Amino acid sequence: LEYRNWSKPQCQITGFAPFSKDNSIRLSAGGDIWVTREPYVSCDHSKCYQFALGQGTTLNNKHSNSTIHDRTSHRTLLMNELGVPFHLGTKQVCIAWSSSSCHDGKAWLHVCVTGDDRNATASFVYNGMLVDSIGSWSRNILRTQESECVCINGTCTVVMTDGSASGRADTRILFIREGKIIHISPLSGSAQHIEECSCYPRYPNVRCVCRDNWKGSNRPVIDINMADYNINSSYVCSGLVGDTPRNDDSSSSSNCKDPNNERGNPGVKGWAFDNDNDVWMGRTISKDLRSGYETFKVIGGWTTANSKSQVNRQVIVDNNNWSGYSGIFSVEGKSCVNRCFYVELIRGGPQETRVWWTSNSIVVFCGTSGTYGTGSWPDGANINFMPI
Amino acid sequence: LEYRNWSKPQCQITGFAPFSKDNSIRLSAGGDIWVTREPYVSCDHSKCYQFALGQGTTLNNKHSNSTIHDRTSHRTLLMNELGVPFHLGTKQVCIAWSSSSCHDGKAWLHVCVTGDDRNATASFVYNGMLVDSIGSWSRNILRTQESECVCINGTCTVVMTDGSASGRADTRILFIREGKIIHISPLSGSAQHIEECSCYPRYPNVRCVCRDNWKGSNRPVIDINMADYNINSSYVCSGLVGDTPRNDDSSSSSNCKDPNNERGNPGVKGWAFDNDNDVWMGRTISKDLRSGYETFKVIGGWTTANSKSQVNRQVIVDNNNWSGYSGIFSVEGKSCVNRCFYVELIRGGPQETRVWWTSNSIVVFCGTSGTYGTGSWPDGANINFMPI
Amino acid sequence: LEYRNWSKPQCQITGFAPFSKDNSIRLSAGGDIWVTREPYVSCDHSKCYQFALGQGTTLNNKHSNSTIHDRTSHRTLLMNELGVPFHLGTKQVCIAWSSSSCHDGKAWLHVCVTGDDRNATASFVYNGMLVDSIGSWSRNILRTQESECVCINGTCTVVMTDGSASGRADTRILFIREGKIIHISPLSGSAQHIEECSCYPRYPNVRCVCRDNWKGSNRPVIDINMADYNINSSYVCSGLVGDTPRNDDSSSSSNCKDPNNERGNPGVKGWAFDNDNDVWMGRTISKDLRSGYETFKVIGGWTTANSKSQVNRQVIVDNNNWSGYSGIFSVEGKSCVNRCFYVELIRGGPQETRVWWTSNSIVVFCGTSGTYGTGSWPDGANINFMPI
Amino acid sequence: LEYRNWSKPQCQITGFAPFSKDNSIRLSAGGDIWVTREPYVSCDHSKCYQFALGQGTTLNNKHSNSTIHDRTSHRTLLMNELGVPFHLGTKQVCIAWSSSSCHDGKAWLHVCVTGDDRNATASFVYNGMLVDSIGSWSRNILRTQESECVCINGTCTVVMTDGSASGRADTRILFIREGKIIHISPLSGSAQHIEECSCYPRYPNVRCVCRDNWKGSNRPVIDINMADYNINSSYVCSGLVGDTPRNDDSSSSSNCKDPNNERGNPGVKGWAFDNDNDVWMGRTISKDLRSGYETFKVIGGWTTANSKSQVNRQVIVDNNNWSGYSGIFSVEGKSCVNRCFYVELIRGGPQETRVWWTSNSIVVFCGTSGTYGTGSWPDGANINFMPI
């Protein structure tokens, strides 16, 4: 077995093609299925897995009530092959109310954060063993990506934050080999607030697009130099911004450098990635709520501030249906590294109060250099058919 | 690992022997089992899998209602080892309301079609990665085999149609290596309408027997030359025709060349295969409805128009029980390539209106050169014992 | 991978030690568990599997009613790792209302009989492929061991019967290589009626102890010469006889040669094996009903007619609890071939009429050359706690 | 494959980090989950498994009643990957109302004890085969560790007791190679009563910390010399004692040598391990009941009698929540052997009489040389949401 280097060029993409869907909520009305949120996808070579933070209960179960307390000690990181819904045979890989996982080519790394808000612990589990742990540096919800980390030549990087969700916080970028923390770099550069980073390999380095929960409806970007541990940061240039909430398209802005001070707080986990001067990005359709999901390319959107010329739009979820978090993962093909993304389809609270629980299903799409059509792939459950 | 070539002669067959049965509907009355239709079987060397298009729900689940809308965004391709019913641990391999899968000797290819009727996407998933995609060329339900594709020396072929279900359409034959489309040949020859092809290796080439939904109750045949991408087509010679609906045996015909204009529309997915001048074929027992299932050999049925001398008949399902789609798969033994087939046993709508759902079980038989007796292997559920 | 030869001496045994128990019926009152009967155990090297004939339904399911019609087309052979109860993820390996399985060192052989009573088919499935089939030779319930077959150097032998259950029938011994029947020897010697053989390797040959359903409460024995296909047969010498029904111990007999004409019909599947002049054997405790289960050694019981001096008795199931079929399997250890046995614990019909179904759990014991104590390991379900 | 030697130094530990949690009881309110008690953890290299003694039933099942009869013939040893709750697909590895398991680097050893209290049998299952068995030597509940055994260079050791739970008994230490007992050493030294040992590798030997159920609330220690089979024994020096019941911290004692005669009977399974002159240990928070769980290091606690200076305390379960048994397991990392522990979280009888059953969930922590914070990780079920 060999370490992944991801040393191929990024695939050409013309858009995205449907890849996977788990139908979790529909199934939960006639089967024992885990209550989850904050899902993601990561792959051991070409074999892809779905992950989520469990609420320590199934859906048709009185313990499903009030999974709006985001951090309890019952929460565990679930891991199944992609497309296998979270049934009762699902492995709980670690104790976690925040996580990130990734495979280095030889084994799985899981970063799992649990415990008290003011004094949390992160456990680093590598090839099934507990190798390292760190306590909270700012005593205010030590927390991480909720999507895949990335490893290059045996070194894995993960972004973590500790401190305020609505003011300056303390973000650090960890470098980890075989589960062991070998270096920690504080955040540097012009990003002013970092949450829930969606990271990808850009060989020899890593790049992340995150969520600013303080002043920005434009998404921050982090560049992680794997050879010297140097961090820089800025904001995606596109004037079509990726966060929710945000201004409408005619009055949204980004200068590439600073938070835009437009509906800055709070936010939603999301992603984008560069292709030369252009950016491919997803976002909720609604500017206000986590409703709908669309992807498009912004011409000049990576290098020209305030660019708003989109092309290759695709609806992933129509705006009559609920979305949620979204994130990037990468898959190395024969000749190029592809980019894929998942969308969390949140059902139940706070937007659907008939039920008392909150859970999600997923839909997943991957980059394509071929052709495609149109559609919409929402959760599909009828809230009136659900146990409450 | 090496590519399959299937370069052995076809096995001698005297008829078929019982191979597999999943009892899906019986179990659905006391267990959480997927609602499915359009099943098939395909094997990774000798290890055989059952596939179907899920309806995004289990049977005992209010979401089971009205799975007569054949194409929704909840539909996913399920894949289990043959004989493992579609329980909640079943992997949803792709998003699909039409599919075909096959193993090239090194990995699995899935062809998955989803999205809007007028602008569908097909995704090509190979070894678990999205490698290619194509959009609809005629904007009218891009669709494929609902049974296994076939690969020879690393090149896989699949038949797809886009356009009218009851008039001339646009059928193309794709050639795919490691998930990538390398060539596309339009249909050519005298077949006038193609649906739901049942294809098999006939080394060095592939042969398919399909469904004509327009003018033919005789089944069209497609020959796919793997070395030069040349396509020819015609109709099975046998005067005992394989489609449903059809004329009764005394007044059914086929000239080997054209649709017979006997009860031409619609049809049912089915199969047949050649042995020298004779044809082995299945069909529903009823000429009108998808009831019963029988197999037999027609002497001269491959090369002599209107031949009606059958022999070696076997009842698979008696005519008091529901059948459905059927298809071919091939299995390479020590010395010869065998032919096998599955029958979809459809329960619920439209023929059984007590329930509101529609789902299926399967029975599976393989060619034998030994001896055998008689029986009937229907679904076996009692519709009055089912949740509605 | 290499063929099993089983070419080590039989282990010394002082009795048997507890090995496995599945608790199937207890679990069926709070879980979806298959209705089964006729279980057995066979091992791929040291990895052991449990097998049974399913009734095409779970227990808490209205289709569980009247599983006293022993042969229907819903019956399939289930196969799980030993100790894994028959949950909804269980693989249905073939269509079968009678079976035998065995592993040749390279792959699994399953012999599966289904279809009409008067014209049944047996399918021979090897490494997951249908390799051969035979039809009924006497048109009266072609049927087989319901326990493991045995393979030596790539040749597997299985005993089958076709004809009367209460008069002379036609028993044949099949020799099968890679799923293909290569020879068939009619039964020969003094056994007069053969059912449900429990067979084991006695290198270079195989030996079986069966059930006589016609005139014998003594068990018949079959010796199968693997080098020349020669069959001989006789009866276990022990005057403590192994069938049920039988005379009480003071008035039971066997002359080693003929059926004893004591309560000859019907019978129960069982086992015994030789150790020099002595026999180790199990049997129901009750002489009349399938209640209780005991093992013991009979001194001179292999070679001296009417020997009744037992020693090393063990209760497996006390006589207040239901038993059922029992059978032998063998496991090769470091230095010797061990003998093990399972007992079917039948619950529900005809002895427990509160429920309408009939199903079983299992208990399993293996030979030991160490020491042991006492106990009783019955099914343990409370019939009043079961769905009906 | 090679035998484990565990020949690396013990890892530095600063405390423990969260590792695993199964949420068994919460899930049992909305899913079919095994009723268990006496869980433990053991790992095949870095791949960790959870084990427990099943009660032959799921929780939502009328058979769940009165699982306070600790030893019945329905009890089996369950084995799943760590973090996979005991769902209906769980394998029952042996028949057991007391057990110990361990992996020698090549295969799994299970020590399983079942049968009558006065004449029990222990079965020794290695690589899936029954290799040996021993009967009861004192005819009074032959019994063992309820946590992992330990193997060095192919020889596995396990501690067993037979005789009184409240007076002198007969404890022996078995040495087993490939499932075969090769030596048995009686207990020797100053420990006066041994139950439920928690053992770990201390290369080239093994060390155990057990439960004294007779006169001691200090925990006995056993040292097992693997080269010469020599046994010595004593008591953990710490004046902060590990058993429950016990005196409060101001009046608890231990002289390193004898039972302390402080609330000597009964006890709870627990663990401790040495680091030079200091001891790391867990215990219930309550001195009286199996409530809460804490870990800490006692300075001089290994070598100085009555030392009470603790440091590095961690709450694992707060004192408002139920605990239970706890035990040690060891995991070899790149450079050192780590120590981990599990806590059984018992719900239902006798402390929670609303329900009629008794079952448990688990939480699991591993040693760390990094940093960490605080929290509490109790079972988390609401007893009023459970079926009774």
Ligand SMILES: *[C@@H]1O[C@H](CO)[C@@H](O[C@@H]2O[C@H](CO)[C@@H](O[C@@H]3O[C@H](CO[C@H]4O[C@H](CO)[C@@H](O)[C@H](O)[C@@H]4O)[C@@H](O)[C@H](O[C@H]4O[C@H](CO)[C@@H](O)[C@H](O)[C@@H]4O[C@H]4O[C@H](CO)[C@@H](O)[C@H](O)[C@@H]4O)[C@@H]3O)[C@H](O)[C@H]2NC(C)=O)[C@H](O)[C@H]1NC(C)=O
């Ligand atoms: C079957 O399926 C295919 C594949 O999904 C689908 O084709 C895709 O259609 C969409 C929608 O038309 C295309 O995406 C749009 O692209 C245009 C720009 O492309 C054109 O113009 C530039 C010149 O600048 C050329 O280079 C280029 O080659 C094209 O001529 C964007 O302008 C679109 O964005 C606007 O419209 C969206 C709604 O469609 C809005 O959501 C978005 O916010 C934008 O609107 C805003 O800007 C407008 C001014 O531009 C303004 O008028 C609005 O009010 C608002 O302020 C969008 O990105 C996509 O590229 C097609 N993909 C491919 C590969 O061809 C087919 O349409 C479909 N078939 C059928 C029958 O429907």
Ligand SMILES: *[C@@H]1O[C@H](CO)[C@@H](O[C@@H]2O[C@H](CO)[C@@H](O[C@@H]3O[C@H](CO[C@H]4O[C@H](CO)[C@@H](O)[C@H](O)[C@@H]4O)[C@@H](O)[C@H](O[C@H]4O[C@H](CO)[C@@H](O)[C@H](O)[C@@H]4O[C@H]4O[C@H](CO)[C@@H](O)[C@H](O)[C@@H]4O)[C@@H]3O)[C@H](O)[C@H]2NC(C)=O)[C@H](O)[C@H]1NC(C)=O
């Ligand atoms: C135990 O199980 C075995 C194996 O399943 C079973 O044997 C099989 O029996 C069937 C039924 O008889 C056989 O299949 C039939 O074969 C005949 C042709 O074979 C004869 O004639 C030709 C001469 O041309 C010889 O070469 C040959 O050797 C035979 O002598 C077909 O004619 C049959 O088809 C007709 O009958 C079917 C009903 O059985 C109809 O469904 C079908 O539509 C055909 O009827 C039509 O054609 C007739 C004119 O031919 C006309 O009269 C009718 O009205 C109608 O228009 C069928 O293919 C099969 O080959 C046997 N298989 C083997 C391997 O031997 C046993 O019968 C069974 N045992 C018992 C006791 O039942």
Ligand SMILES: *[C@@H]1O[C@H](CO)[C@@H](O[C@@H]2O[C@H](CO)[C@@H](O[C@@H]3O[C@H](CO[C@H]4O[C@H](CO)[C@@H](O)[C@H](O)[C@@H]4O)[C@@H](O)[C@H](O[C@H]4O[C@H](CO)[C@@H](O)[C@H](O)[C@@H]4O[C@H]4O[C@H](CO)[C@@H](O)[C@H](O)[C@@H]4O)[C@@H]3O)[C@H](O)[C@H]2NC(C)=O)[C@H](O)[C@H]1NC(C)=O
């Ligand atoms: C803890 O657990 C152990 C292991 O399970 C257990 O030891 C086992 O006990 C049983 C029961 O005693 C033993 O099995 C019996 O063996 C005797 C023969 O052995 C003795 O005699 C011969 C001389 O011929 C010596 O060679 C030998 O070494 C012994 O001295 C059998 O006679 C027994 O069978 C009769 O009794 C059974 C009931 O126990 C009946 O079911 C059976 O039908 C037999 O009864 C019939 O025959 C009798 C005449 O023999 C007649 O009187 C009756 O009415 C009837 O017609 C049985 O096979 C076994 O060997 C022991 N195993 C070992 C390894 O030692 C301990 O007993 C147990 N501890 C406690 C406290 O109970």
Ligand SMILES: *[C@@H]1O[C@H](CO)[C@@H](O[C@@H]2O[C@H](CO)[C@@H](O[C@@H]3O[C@H](CO[C@H]4O[C@H](CO)[C@@H](O)[C@H](O)[C@@H]4O)[C@@H](O)[C@H](O[C@H]4O[C@H](CO)[C@@H](O)[C@H](O)[C@@H]4O[C@H]4O[C@H](CO)[C@@H](O)[C@H](O)[C@@H]4O)[C@@H]3O)[C@H](O)[C@H]2NC(C)=O)[C@H](O)[C@H]1NC(C)=O
């Ligand atoms: C975020 O999370 C971290 C990591 O969990 C946590 O830090 C940990 O705090 C605990 C609690 O303070 C520490 O454990 C205690 O250690 C002291 C000893 O350490 C001091 O003293 C010695 C000098 O001997 C120095 O070597 C050392 O460096 C320290 O200065 C123990 O005394 C503690 O035990 C007592 O208190 C416990 C309650 O906390 C009682 O349960 C226990 O029974 C002991 O009390 C008894 O003894 C007392 C006499 O000593 C007596 O007064 C009492 O009445 C009673 O009889 C305990 O072991 C631990 O080491 C810290 N860990 C690390 C790695 O730093 C943070 O506190 C947390 N953050 C926040 C904001 O809370």
Ligand SMILES: *[C@@H]1O[C@H](CO)[C@@H](O[C@@H]2O[C@H](CO)[C@@H](O)[C@H](O)[C@H]2NC(C)=O)[C@H](O)[C@H]1NC(C)=O
């Ligand atoms: C679950 O959670 C909430 C909080 O406990 C419950 O909502 C309360 O229900 C009670 C009793 O019906 C009311 O008196 C309160 O006014 C409700 N509180 C709130 C904040 O709305 C809810 O009832 C529970 N749901 C279920 C299904 O058990």
Ligand SMILES: *[C@@H]1O[C@H](CO)[C@@H](O[C@@H]2O[C@H](CO)[C@@H](O)[C@H](O)[C@H]2NC(C)=O)[C@H](O)[C@H]1NC(C)=O
């Ligand atoms: C499933 O779907 C169909 C369509 O929604 C429902 O059938 C209707 O039921 C209503 C209310 O009982 C009737 O008034 C309509 O006449 C029915 N429509 C048709 C087209 O027959 C059906 O009721 C739903 N079934 C279940 C079990 O919910």
Ligand SMILES: *[C@@H]1O[C@H](CO)[C@@H](O[C@@H]2O[C@H](CO)[C@@H](O)[C@H](O)[C@H]2NC(C)=O)[C@H](O)[C@H]1NC(C)=O
């Ligand atoms: C299942 O099987 C048997 C046969 O159908 C049923 O027994 C009959 O029940 C009916 C209606 O209650 C009675 O009138 C008959 O006298 C019964 N027949 C016999 C042969 O006893 C039984 O009721 C069915 N059981 C269930 C639970 O559905």
Ligand SMILES: *[C@@H]1O[C@H](CO)[C@@H](O[C@@H]2O[C@H](CO)[C@@H](O)[C@H](O)[C@H]2NC(C)=O)[C@H](O)[C@H]1NC(C)=O
């Ligand atoms: C579970 O087991 C116990 C013992 O059988 C049962 O407790 C008894 O219940 C009966 C009937 O309600 C009472 O009259 C007795 O006084 C109870 N006995 C004791 C010792 O308390 C209990 O009822 C059974 N529980 C269930 C749910 O069936």
Ligand SMILES: *[C@@H]1O[C@H](CO)[C@@H](O)[C@H](O)[C@H]1NC(C)=O
């Ligand atoms: C990968 O890391 C190794 C080990 O430190 C180093 O020697 C090697 O140069 C690296 N490979 C690349 C492609 O940078």
Ligand SMILES: *[C@@H]1O[C@H](CO)[C@@H](O)[C@H](O)[C@H]1NC(C)=O
């Ligand atoms: C299989 O394809 C390879 C690679 O292109 C080719 O060189 C070879 O000739 C082919 N084999 C056969 C049997 O046609």
Ligand SMILES: *[C@@H]1O[C@H](CO)[C@@H](O)[C@H](O)[C@H]1NC(C)=O
């Ligand atoms: C096993 O069978 C082979 C192949 O036919 C034969 O040559 C060989 O002698 C046999 N081995 C034994 C031990 O009989």
Ligand SMILES: *[C@@H]1O[C@H](CO)[C@@H](O)[C@H](O)[C@H]1NC(C)=O
């Ligand atoms: C392990 O056991 C082997 C086989 O008996 C022995 O020869 C060898 O010396 C042992 N290794 C160690 C490290 O003691």
Ligand SMILES: [Ca+2]
């Ligand atoms: Ca924001």
Ligand SMILES: [Ca+2]
């Ligand atoms: Ca037609």
Ligand SMILES: [Ca+2]
């Ligand atoms: Ca008999």
Ligand SMILES: [Ca+2]
């Ligand atoms: Ca004590």
